[PDB]
Design an enzyme around this catalytic site. Structure first.
Site, PDB file in Angstrom:
ATOM      1  N   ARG A 268       0.820  -1.214   0.000  1.00 53.16           N
ATOM      2  CA  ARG A 268       0.000   0.000   0.000  1.00 53.16           C
ATOM      3  C   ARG A 268       0.854   1.264   0.000  1.00 53.16           C
ATOM      4  O   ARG A 268       0.542   2.240   0.686  1.00 53.16           O
ATOM      5  CB  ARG A 268      -0.946   0.032   1.194  1.00 53.16           C
ATOM      6  CG  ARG A 268      -1.817  -1.141   1.260  1.00 53.16           C
ATOM      7  CD  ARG A 268      -2.567  -1.218  -0.038  1.00 53.16           C
ATOM      8  NE  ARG A 268      -3.861  -1.764   0.278  1.00 53.16           N
ATOM      9  CZ  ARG A 268      -4.085  -3.060   0.218  1.00 53.16           C
ATOM     10  NH1 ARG A 268      -3.103  -3.859  -0.172  1.00 53.16           N
ATOM     11  NH2 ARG A 268      -5.254  -3.535   0.548  1.00 53.16           N
TER      12      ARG A 268
ATOM     13  N   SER B  12     -10.406  -0.262   4.514  1.00 55.77           N
ATOM     14  CA  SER B  12      -9.539  -0.646   5.620  1.00 55.77           C
ATOM     15  C   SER B  12      -8.745   0.564   6.079  1.00 55.77           C
ATOM     16  O   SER B  12      -7.943   1.099   5.315  1.00 55.77           O
ATOM     17  CB  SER B  12      -8.587  -1.769   5.201  1.00 55.77           C
ATOM     18  OG  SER B  12      -7.712  -2.084   6.282  1.00 55.77           O
TER      19      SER B  12
ATOM     20  N   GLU C 184      -3.943   3.369   6.180  1.00 57.38           N
ATOM     21  CA  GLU C 184      -3.973   3.327   4.720  1.00 57.38           C
ATOM     22  C   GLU C 184      -4.404   4.681   4.139  1.00 57.38           C
ATOM     23  O   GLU C 184      -3.753   5.171   3.204  1.00 57.38           O
ATOM     24  CB  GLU C 184      -4.886   2.181   4.218  1.00 57.38           C
ATOM     25  CG  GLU C 184      -4.632   1.802   2.753  1.00 57.38           C
ATOM     26  CD  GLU C 184      -5.539   0.681   2.240  1.00 57.38           C
ATOM     27  OE1 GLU C 184      -6.783   0.848   2.259  1.00 57.38           O
ATOM     28  OE2 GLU C 184      -5.004  -0.364   1.796  1.00 57.38           O
TER      29      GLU C 184
HETATM   30  C1  LIG Z   1     -15.300   0.893   0.330  1.00 56.10           C
HETATM   31  C2  LIG Z   1     -13.833   1.004   0.044  1.00 56.10           C
HETATM   32  C3  LIG Z   1     -13.116  -0.139  -0.258  1.00 56.10           C
HETATM   33  C4  LIG Z   1     -11.746  -0.085  -0.533  1.00 56.10           C
HETATM   34  N1  LIG Z   1     -11.081  -1.264  -0.823  1.00 56.10           N
HETATM   35  C5  LIG Z   1      -9.796  -1.207  -1.081  1.00 56.10           C
HETATM   36  C6  LIG Z   1      -9.090  -2.433  -1.391  1.00 56.10           C
HETATM   37  O1  LIG Z   1      -9.596  -3.548  -1.434  1.00 56.10           O
HETATM   38  N2  LIG Z   1      -7.743  -2.286  -1.645  1.00 56.10           N
HETATM   39  C7  LIG Z   1      -7.054  -1.078  -1.616  1.00 56.10           C
HETATM   40  O2  LIG Z   1      -5.855  -1.076  -1.855  1.00 56.10           O
HETATM   41  N3  LIG Z   1      -7.721   0.075  -1.328  1.00 56.10           N
HETATM   42  C8  LIG Z   1      -9.007   0.023  -1.068  1.00 56.10           C
HETATM   43  N4  LIG Z   1      -9.690   1.177  -0.771  1.00 56.10           N
HETATM   44  C9  LIG Z   1      -8.905   2.475  -0.753  1.00 56.10           C
HETATM   45  C10 LIG Z   1      -8.260   2.791  -2.103  1.00 56.10           C
HETATM   46  O3  LIG Z   1      -6.999   3.457  -2.035  1.00 56.10           O
HETATM   47  C11 LIG Z   1      -9.183   3.708  -2.868  1.00 56.10           C
HETATM   48  O4  LIG Z   1     -10.417   3.015  -3.001  1.00 56.10           O
HETATM   49  C12 LIG Z   1      -8.581   4.242  -4.171  1.00 56.10           C
HETATM   50  O5  LIG Z   1      -7.338   3.657  -4.559  1.00 56.10           O
HETATM   51  C13 LIG Z   1      -8.262   5.704  -4.007  1.00 56.10           C
HETATM   52  O6  LIG Z   1      -8.547   6.352  -5.248  1.00 56.10           O
HETATM   53  P1  LIG Z   1      -9.241   7.745  -5.270  1.00 56.10           P
HETATM   54  O7  LIG Z   1      -9.112   8.091  -6.749  1.00 56.10           O
HETATM   55  O8  LIG Z   1     -10.478   7.630  -4.486  1.00 56.10           O
HETATM   56  O9  LIG Z   1      -8.152   8.587  -4.459  1.00 56.10           O
HETATM   57  P2  LIG Z   1      -8.387   9.841  -3.509  1.00 56.10           P
HETATM   58  O10 LIG Z   1      -8.825   9.410  -2.181  1.00 56.10           O
HETATM   59  O11 LIG Z   1      -9.112  10.887  -4.303  1.00 56.10           O
HETATM   60  O12 LIG Z   1      -6.954  10.303  -3.245  1.00 56.10           O
HETATM   61  C14 LIG Z   1      -6.104   9.610  -2.312  1.00 56.10           C
HETATM   62  C15 LIG Z   1      -4.754  10.214  -2.315  1.00 56.10           C
HETATM   63  O13 LIG Z   1      -4.126  10.026  -3.599  1.00 56.10           O
HETATM   64  C16 LIG Z   1      -3.977  11.267  -4.248  1.00 56.10           C
HETATM   65  N5  LIG Z   1      -4.306  11.231  -5.685  1.00 56.10           N
HETATM   66  C17 LIG Z   1      -5.480  10.920  -6.329  1.00 56.10           C
HETATM   67  N6  LIG Z   1      -5.431  11.072  -7.638  1.00 56.10           N
HETATM   68  C18 LIG Z   1      -4.160  11.538  -7.869  1.00 56.10           C
HETATM   69  C19 LIG Z   1      -3.451  11.898  -9.044  1.00 56.10           C
HETATM   70  N7  LIG Z   1      -3.971  11.817 -10.287  1.00 56.10           N
HETATM   71  N8  LIG Z   1      -2.179  12.324  -8.924  1.00 56.10           N
HETATM   72  C20 LIG Z   1      -1.640  12.416  -7.703  1.00 56.10           C
HETATM   73  N9  LIG Z   1      -2.205  12.131  -6.532  1.00 56.10           N
HETATM   74  C21 LIG Z   1      -3.452  11.688  -6.676  1.00 56.10           C
HETATM   75  C22 LIG Z   1      -4.779  12.285  -3.451  1.00 56.10           C
HETATM   76  O14 LIG Z   1      -4.087  13.516  -3.522  1.00 56.10           O
HETATM   77  C23 LIG Z   1      -4.717  11.709  -2.049  1.00 56.10           C
HETATM   78  O15 LIG Z   1      -3.476  12.025  -1.449  1.00 56.10           O
HETATM   79  C24 LIG Z   1     -11.075   1.180  -0.480  1.00 56.10           C
HETATM   80  C25 LIG Z   1     -11.805   2.315  -0.179  1.00 56.10           C
HETATM   81  C26 LIG Z   1     -13.175   2.249   0.090  1.00 56.10           C
HETATM   82  C27 LIG Z   1     -13.975   3.484   0.423  1.00 56.10           C
HETATM   83  C1  LIG Z   2     -10.504  -7.039   1.648  1.00 53.33           C
HETATM   84  C2  LIG Z   2      -9.403  -5.983   1.673  1.00 53.33           C
HETATM   85  C3  LIG Z   2      -8.031  -6.143   1.277  1.00 53.33           C
HETATM   86  C4  LIG Z   2      -7.305  -7.374   0.758  1.00 53.33           C
HETATM   87  O1  LIG Z   2      -7.919  -8.381   0.265  1.00 53.33           O
HETATM   88  O2  LIG Z   2      -6.042  -7.340   0.858  1.00 53.33           O
HETATM   89  N1  LIG Z   2      -7.443  -4.957   1.478  1.00 53.33           N
HETATM   90  N2  LIG Z   2      -8.329  -4.098   1.945  1.00 53.33           N
HETATM   91  N3  LIG Z   2      -9.508  -4.704   2.055  1.00 53.33           N
HETATM   92  C5  LIG Z   2     -10.677  -4.045   2.593  1.00 53.33           C
HETATM   93  C6  LIG Z   2     -11.019  -4.363   3.914  1.00 53.33           C
HETATM   94  C7  LIG Z   2     -12.105  -3.757   4.545  1.00 53.33           C
HETATM   95  C8  LIG Z   2     -12.844  -2.824   3.828  1.00 53.33           C
HETATM   96  C9  LIG Z   2     -12.490  -2.498   2.521  1.00 53.33           C
HETATM   97  C10 LIG Z   2     -11.391  -3.098   1.894  1.00 53.33           C
END
Ligand SMILES: Cc1cc2nc3c(=O)[nH]c(=O)nc-3n(C[C@H](O)[C@H](O)[C@H](O)COP(=O)(O)OP(=O)(O)OC[C@H]3O[C@@H](n4cnc5c(N)ncnc54)[C@H](O)[C@@H]3O)c2cc1C
Ligand SMILES: Cc1c(C(=O)O)nnn1-c1ccccc1
Length: 337
Positions: free
Chosen positions: A164, A237, A333
């Site tokens: 991450r 998470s 995260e």
């Molecule tokens: C319900 C839910 C489930 C999720 N499940 C997972 C999962 O399974 N695995 C996982 O790894 N993550 C998970 N996430 C988090 C994950 O990081 C985000 O879902 C996604 O990657 C973030 O993208 P965003 O475009 O929403 O970023 P944002 O939240 O808009 O931005 C996050 C950060 O990145 C930056 N950023 C965004 N776009 C750019 C760009 N073009 N250039 C530079 N910086 C930028 C922003 O400035 C900020 O610092 C989950 C989140 C939620 C709400």
């Molecule tokens: C399943 C999962 C994983 C994984 O499978 O590694 N990472 N985050 N995440 C997650 C956990 C809780 C809520 C939303 C996303």
């Protein structure tokens, strides 16, 4: 640029935090990105890049120009038989891009189905789920250097991917990711190490399973177990699974046989952060409008009306507790602003 002043950021972040931004623009291409940068610089304002706001914790009003990346574009770059290079603009929504790839018959992204957010943010966070990370399929990206405005390309090594983590998350204000190139495949063997994914796939009795088949199982499991911010605000998470050295793992497992952990190639042990938080008494915790989800102990939640500061302080509380109790520090995260 559809600029707004003093605009609420509530619909732009999955936690549902209600802070307001001094300016909010929407960038649909690289010229917009450049116009927004000059505008922020002309007016003495920082620039805050946001995608889908699903990895952001906003904790105060934003005295900046908030730039929503909304550029569109997805295409096949080169088809090299099994390998296929594909390319997407930073504003493209991640899960429709996964579905776009599977509809082209390409494998590689199925285990990352239904993750929220944008293509541009995915390399910065090195998104990962069910045993796959973005770095496994990453070819390159184009990013604007915010120190001098030039464009450079990053290949996989230069992105310094970690769990991450990435160079971009270490230097968060430095690079602005414009487009991302991934290497997908055909006819490859299929990543089913995770027990429940394999079991549910087998229950369906597909004669010859494909990436699309895996994708529909992961979507079902995620819909079944993971709170949707639509209903209950969250950033997924909140904490990362921590790594500990062999000595720390010896004292912890010798004190907790039920310890859930994932052994690594270098002898270190990646602990299940959800097990640490559950075993610490936090699952189902609720104090005012914030708490910990009743089944997913990793997921901090906004029950309604929370400030970003209250979410931040609950996390600091959980952190201090787990540090005091098992001598392990949980890193978050989400990105904090
Ligand atoms: C319900 C839910 C489930 C999720 N499940 C997972 C999962 O399974 N695995 C996982 O790894 N993550 C998970 N996430 C988090 C994950 O990081 C985000 O879902 C996604 O990657 C973030 O993208 P965003 O475009 O929403 O970023 P944002 O939240 O808009 O931005 C996050 C950060 O990145 C930056 N950023 C965004 N776009 C750019 C760009 N073009 N250039 C530079 N910086 C930028 C922003 O400035 C900020 O610092 C989950 C989140 C939620 C709400
Ligand atoms: C399943 C999962 C994983 C994984 O499978 O590694 N990472 N985050 N995440 C997650 C956990 C809780 C809520 C939303 C996303």
């Amino acid at each position: 640029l559809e600029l707004q002043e003093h605009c609420s950021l509530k619909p732009y972040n999955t936690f549902g935090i209600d802070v307001r931004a001094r300016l909010l623009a929407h960038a649909r291409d690289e010229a917009d990105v450049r116009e927004a940068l000059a505008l922020a610089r002309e007016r003495g304002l920082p620039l805050l890049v946001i995608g889908g706001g699903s990895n952001l914790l906003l904790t105060r009003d934003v005295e900046a120009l908030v730039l929503r990346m909304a550029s569109q574009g997805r295409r096949i770059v080169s088809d090299a038989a099994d390998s296929v290079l594909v390319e997407a603009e930073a504003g493209e929504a991640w899960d429709p891009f996964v579905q776009w790839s599977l509809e082209r018959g390409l494998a590689g992204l199925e285990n990352l189905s239904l993750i929220p957010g944008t293509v541009g943010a995915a390399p910065m966070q090195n998104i990962g789920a069910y045993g796959v990370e973005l770095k496994d399929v990453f070819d390159s990206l184009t990013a604007l250097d915010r120190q001098d405005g030039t464009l450079r390309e990053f290949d996989r090594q230069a992105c310094r991917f970690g769990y991450r983590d990435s160079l971009f998350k270490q230097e968060p204000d430095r690079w602005l990711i414009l487009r991302v190139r991934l290497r997908l495949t055909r006819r490859e063997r299929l990543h089913l190490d995770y027990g429940p994914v394999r079991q549910r796939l087998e229950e369906e009795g597909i004669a010859s399973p494909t990436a699309r088949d895996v994708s529909r199982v992961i979507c079902a499991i995620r819909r079944e177990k993971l709170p949707d911010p639509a209903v209950l605000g969250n950033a997924g998470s909140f904490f990362k699974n921590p790594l500990v050295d062999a000595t720390q793992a010896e004292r912890l497992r010798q004190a907790f046989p039920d310890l859930v952990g994932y052994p690594q190639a270098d002898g270190r042990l990646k602990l299940a952060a959800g097990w640490l938080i559950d075993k610490g008494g936090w699952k189902g915790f609720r104090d005012g409008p914030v708490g910990v989800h009743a089944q997913q102990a990793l997921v901090l939640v906004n029950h309604g009306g929370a400030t970003g500061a209250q979410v931040r302080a609950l996390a600091e509380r959980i952190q201090e507790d787990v540090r005091r109790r098992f001598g392990v520090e949980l890193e978050p995260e989400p990105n904090l602003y």
